[PDB]
């Protein structure tokens, strides 16, 4: 389903993380019935909630705005060796700078129950 | 700041993609003045908008709920060659299955200007 905002249409697309950061393709059926085949160029990253525009695919023409949702892999989707390799592909890590002499509580993350 | 949810507290934490999918650590000052040092175990993925619980760090005690936002790298953050390496670390890609005989419009993505 598409939402109408003035003369523009808004569509919420979901793509996998790989395509989001390494490029790929996705498609969707337009309200006209034609299918739009979209290519995400390697190098042009799609971030969570980011918006992009498809020129002239709106209403009498306006544009089509795609709002992206990125699906992440589940736990243990790869080996530890590969996870180490990610450190060489992705940008430098950000580590905490805890004030010296502050009291620190080493905590663990527990799963959140929807209800 | 922290939002009070009855007996629990809610904190909006932002981490880089690297830590989100490969593990690492982050810290935050608690309402008590104490600093919480959190370790994200390699293999335990954090997804956009995902919530996690730090038990006992709530209100007189309840729990602390952390809602994560994942910061993504800008465009051209690595070599084309490295992007292809991602293909072997992340799960299989999802590609378009467009109905044959359907009208197909090859589209390009343009930036979304807030103004």
Curated annotation (Swiss-Prot), chains A, B:
Inducing or repressing factors: YDJ1 is a heat shock gene whose expression increases moderately at elevated temperatures.
List the residue(s) that the UniProt entry marks as the site Involved in dimerization: 72
Location comes to: Cytoplasm; Cytoplasm, Perinuclear region
Substitution effect: residue 72 to D = Prevents dimerization
Q: How does it assemble?
A: Homodimer. Interacts with HAP1. Component of the HMC including HAP1, SRO9 and YDJ1.
Function of the molecule: Probably involved in mitochondrial protein import. Is also required for efficient translocation of pre-pro-alpha-factor. Involved in heme regulation of HAP1, as a component of the high-molecular-weight (HMC) complex.
Q: What else is known?
A: Present with 119000 molecules/cell in log phase SD medium.
The name this protein goes by in its record: Mitochondrial protein import protein MAS5
What species is given as this protein's source? Saccharomyces cerevisiae (strain ATCC 204508 / S288c) (Baker's yeast)
């Amino acid at each position: 389903s598409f939402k109408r905002d003035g003369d523009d249409l808004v569509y919420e697309a979901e793509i996998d993380l790989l395509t989001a950061i390494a490029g790929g393709e996705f498609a969707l059926e337009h309200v006209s019935g034609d299918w739009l085949k979209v290519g995400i160029v390697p190098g042009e990253v799609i971030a969570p909630g980011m918006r992009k525009v498809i020129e002239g695919k709106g209403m009498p023409y306006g544009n089509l705005i795609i709002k992206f949702t990125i699906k992440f892999p589940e736990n243990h989707f790869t080996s530890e060796e590969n996870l180490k390799k990610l450190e060489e592909i992705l940008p430098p890590r950000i580590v905490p700078a805890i004030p010296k002499k502050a009291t620190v509580d080493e905590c663990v993350l527990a799963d959140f129950d929807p209800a």
